[PDB]
Design an enzyme around this catalytic site. Structure first.
Site, short mmCIF file in Angstrom:
data_model
loop_
_atom_site.label_atom_id
_atom_site.label_comp_id
_atom_site.label_asym_id
_atom_site.label_seq_id
_atom_site.Cartn_x
_atom_site.Cartn_y
_atom_site.Cartn_z
N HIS A 1 0.30 0.78 7.81
CA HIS A 1 -0.66 0.81 6.72
C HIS A 1 -0.94 2.23 6.22
O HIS A 1 -1.29 3.11 7.03
CB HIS A 1 -1.99 0.19 7.19
CG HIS A 1 -2.83 -0.38 6.08
ND1 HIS A 1 -2.31 -0.76 4.86
CD2 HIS A 1 -4.14 -0.69 6.04
CE1 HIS A 1 -3.28 -1.25 4.10
NE2 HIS A 1 -4.40 -1.22 4.80
N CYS A 48 0.82 -1.21 0.00
CA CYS A 48 0.00 0.00 0.00
C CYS A 48 0.86 1.27 0.00
O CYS A 48 0.37 2.35 -0.30
CB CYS A 48 -0.96 0.00 1.19
SG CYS A 48 -0.15 -0.34 2.77
#
Lengths: 264, 579
Positions: free
Chosen positions: A220, A9
């Site tokens: 994340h 990500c």
């Protein structure tokens, strides 16, 4: 939407944050118009305005070109951004550039030697801006000085030698899209949607990139963008309203990379 | 970074005149003698008599970088220096040579300090450390055995720029980049008082005979007098417009003499609106020295960032200097011509000179020709880098490092060197052989050879071994052979040097892979192979080949005396076509 191949990500969130940088999206579609990491990104970008997507084409190329991502573990979006941006900024300089026009500005960094107390002054460029924790001040004015000591003394003109010194920086020329980035070695760091910057050229906040957790290589990333606002996390694409920004200013969650497009 | 380099300096056997500015002054009224301390690693001596035509007495040469502070003791029987090479050295001020060296500092050693009564001294520097030494041991110290009772002193947050001890040897104060002034008791190393009050860098400290009140001058431009008795500043004093870097004081401890980036040499009295503008020096003022010949101090010597040192006498008070100790030009700009064995400099007098780096000597002076157009009048060749250059001493200091010292291979032919054939030769390699020419270990015969064999470095050339900041050892090329200077070599010269100079073990060649094609072919060759030899290959794929083959990179026709690396470096894996 862009699939997650496991801790990738760091890419998906920069790519979709560059995709809502209007000037930059445009020049790239005209580049596949007429096989390096730039053809891979174009081939990618060329296929998003088409129709959830696997970016495996791009990943394949990225980590076979740069071995700092070629492992299961996470990475740092700003490494990637600066890599991706520079690696375009010269892939073009070979074949100033359309990237340079967009993201490039300059800053003044002043270097006061301590033996002469000469305020020496020289300039240097940037595609992005890395600054440490109110946003309004960091651009408009200066840094706060950071000394230069053990193995990091400064070469002086007057001195004709390397002697201790003080560095600090100030934006000397804002760019069209100001790529901006915040420290890590977290807070309540405030950031506006419209930003009054040095002819006062002020900037609409167009894209941003946030980080969940408490250290920038195990958590994340996600993405927030300009819609013709929207919240993008790897398989999902759900809308969000402009007041759900201040949530991101232990794992007291902050943000990371701000894009300010000019009101230009 | 505790890995070792080899430096040397390009200079005349004797450099009578300071070839860069002066950081410190000492005066021996006993022998009419003045000692300056250069921003060129040289302490020179002078005679102050109006008599002397050139006053110059001697040169005291053992440092590698800016000498920063000097201190005379036992009545100038013994001088002590401190330098940017991390060393505090200890001399014989009468004869003019260097007894011992103290390497306990970890960075540029900036200021020194002397408590005459107790005969104890202090050195301090950018490594934030303060050291104490009892002089009578240091005068008994050597180059072979310099291990002594060294007291240490503790507290400082940041890099220290000034230091001063009371006459009695009972008080010592330091001033640093933290605006505060930490104070200690010398005979116990115990801390006495902080002394907050400043807003900048304190480059100058002084004490009264009892060290009860003291002065401080700063880069805020303020002189503050402090009462230690009450641990408080008692008066500030803005005479100056820019930071103050230099002070001195009368025997009564009442009239101050100062000087800064201003150049203005004011002198004011605590009784502070009676300021006496002595002069406006042509250069920022580094430090000053009073004459204590007789009280109403007659004259004050003044050292600047300028090579020349004057004495001034006691809207401007004076206008012309009462004394002139002349000085050299400082090289300030450099250029390496890309044969990588020659250099063009340009001094403060705008004199451009062409030098040879390998043989370590000047080729010529070119008066004052346009420098940046003289660099053109520019052979089109590439040789890899092998050395680097600094001008910190105002002189050509040349540095060799393991990483690439052995990059440069050229042909005996292309280096001038005779050949009744033409061998391959490594530049730095010959050099190390030639700097350690007189070192008897270098006298190995392989299958008695001393030297490299083509040239010699000038016997007076200093050879220096510094960690990538500490300087570990220093001798002149000629003195490589003395027994005392040679047990010290075996201690210091690093293996990467030994291998070549002592074992005579020669290093890697660099080959270059390249493609050749009018199906391409894979070739490789020494990166200094003449293009001629490649056309000689095309024929079989000897002068007949000059006539027949034509070689071509990036569709440009190839000079058949060019070596491959020139081609790839300029015209351009490398590829060449034929016809």
């Amino acid at each position: 939407g862009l699939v997650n191949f496991g801790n990738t990500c760091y890419c998906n969130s920069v790519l979709q944050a560059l995709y809502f940088c209007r000037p930059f999206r445009e020049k790239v579609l005209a580049y596949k118009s007429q096989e390096s990491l730039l053809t891979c990104l174009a081939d990618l970008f060329h296929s998003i305005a088409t129709q959830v997507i696997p970016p495996k084409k791009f990943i394949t190329r990225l980590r076979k070109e740069n071995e700092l991502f070629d492992n299961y573990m996470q990475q740092d979006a700003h490494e990637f951004l600066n890599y991706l941006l520079n690696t375009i900024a010269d892939i073009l300089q070979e074949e100033p550039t359309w990237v340079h026009e967009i993201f490039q500005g300059t800053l003044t960094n002043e270097t006061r030697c301590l033996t002469c107390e000469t305020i020496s002054s020289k300039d240097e460029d940037f595609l992005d801006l890395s600054v440490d924790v109110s946003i309004t001040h960091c651009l408009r004015g200066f840094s706060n000085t950071e000394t230069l000591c053990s193995e990091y003394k400064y070469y002086c003109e007057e001195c004709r030698s390397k002697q201790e010194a003080h560095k600090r920086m100030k934006v000397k020329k804002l760019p069209m899209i100001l790529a901006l980035h915040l420290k890590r070695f977290s807070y309540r760091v405030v950031f506006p949607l419209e930003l009054r910057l040095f002819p006062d050229r002020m900037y609409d906040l167009v894209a941003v990139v946030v980080h969940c957790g408490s250290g920038p290589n195990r958590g994340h990333y996600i993405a927030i963008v300009k819609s013709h606002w929207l919240l993008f996390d790897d398989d999902i694409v759900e809308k969000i309203d402009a007041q759900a920004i201040e949530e991101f200013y232990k794992n007291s969650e902050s943000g990371y990379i701000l894009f300010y497009q000019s009101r230009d | 970074r505790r890995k070792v380099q080899v430096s040397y300096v390009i200079r005349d056997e004797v450099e009578k005149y300071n070839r860069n500015g002066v950081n410190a002054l000492q005066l021996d009224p006993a022998l009419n003698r003045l000692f300056t301390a250069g921003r060129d690693s040289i302490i020179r001596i002078w005679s102050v008599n109006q008599h002397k035509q050139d006053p110059y007495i001697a040169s005291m040469e053992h440092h590698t970088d800016w000498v920063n502070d000097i201190v005379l003791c036992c009545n100038g029987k013994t001088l002590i220096s401190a330098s940017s090479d991390t060393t505090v050295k200890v001399w014989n001020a009468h004869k003019g040579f260097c007894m011992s060296t103290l390497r306990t500092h970890k960075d540029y050693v900036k200021a020194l300090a002397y408590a005459k009564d107790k005969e104890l001294v202090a050195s301090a520097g950018l490594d934030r450390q303060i050291f104490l030494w009892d002089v009578n041991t240091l005068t008994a110290l050597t180059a072979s055995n310099n291990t002594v009772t060294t007291s240490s002193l503790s507290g400082n947050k940041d890099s220290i720029y000034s230091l001063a001890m009371n006459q009695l040897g009972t008080i010592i104060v330091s001033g640093s980049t933290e605006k505060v002034l930490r104070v200690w008791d010398p005979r116990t190393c115990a801390k006495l008082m902080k002394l907050k009050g400043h807003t900048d860098n304190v480059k100058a400290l002084l004490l009264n005979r009892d060290g009860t009140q003291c002065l401080s001058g700063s880069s805020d431009g303020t002189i503050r007098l402090w009462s230690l008795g009450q641990q408080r500043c008692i008066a500030t004093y803005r005479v100056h417009d820019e930071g103050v870097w230099a002070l001195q004081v009368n025997d009564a401890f009442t009239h101050v003499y100062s000087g800064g980036r201003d150049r203005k040499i004011y002198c004011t009295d605590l009784r502070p609106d009676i300021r006496v503008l002595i002069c406006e020096e042509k250069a920022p003022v580094l430090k000053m020295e009073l004459d204590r010949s007789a009280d109403p101090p007659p004259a004050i010597w003044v050292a600047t960032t300028k090579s020349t040192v004057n004495k001034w006498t006691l809207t401007p008070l004076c206008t012309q200097p009462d004394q002139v100790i002349k000085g050299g030009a400082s090289i300030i700009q450099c250029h390496i011509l890309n044969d990588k064995r020659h250099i063009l400099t340009k001094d403060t007098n705008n004199n451009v000179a062409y030098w040879d780096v390998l043989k370590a000597c000047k080729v010529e002076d070119l008066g004052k020709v346009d420098f940046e157009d003289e660099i053109k009048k520019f052979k089109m060749v590439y040789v890899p880098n092998w050395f680097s250059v600094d001008l910190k001493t105002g002189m050509l200091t040349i540095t060799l490092d393991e990483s690439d010292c052995f990059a440069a291979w050229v042909s005996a032919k292309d280096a001038g060197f005779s050949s009744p054939s033409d061998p391959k030769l490594n530049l730095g390699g010959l050099l190390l052989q030639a700097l350690l020419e007189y070192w008897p270990r270098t006298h190995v015969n392989p299958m008695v050879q001393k030297g490299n064999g083509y040239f010699q470095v000038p016997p007076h050339t200093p050879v220096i071994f510094g960690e990538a900041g500490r300087t570990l050892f220093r001798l002149l090329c000629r003195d490589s052979g003395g027994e005392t200077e040679s047990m010290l070599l075996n201690e210091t010269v690093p293996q990467w040097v030994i291998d070549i100079t002592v074992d005579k073990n020669m290093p890697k060649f660099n080959k270059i892979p390249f493609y050749l094609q009018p199906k391409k072919d894979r070739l490789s060759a020494s990166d200094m192979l003449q293009v001629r030899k490649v056309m000689e290959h095309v024929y079989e794929k000897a002068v007949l080949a000059e006539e027949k083959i034509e070689l071509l990179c990036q569709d440009q026709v190839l000079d058949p005396n060019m070596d491959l690396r020139t081609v790839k470096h300029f015209i351009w894996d490398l590829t060449l076509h034929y016809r």
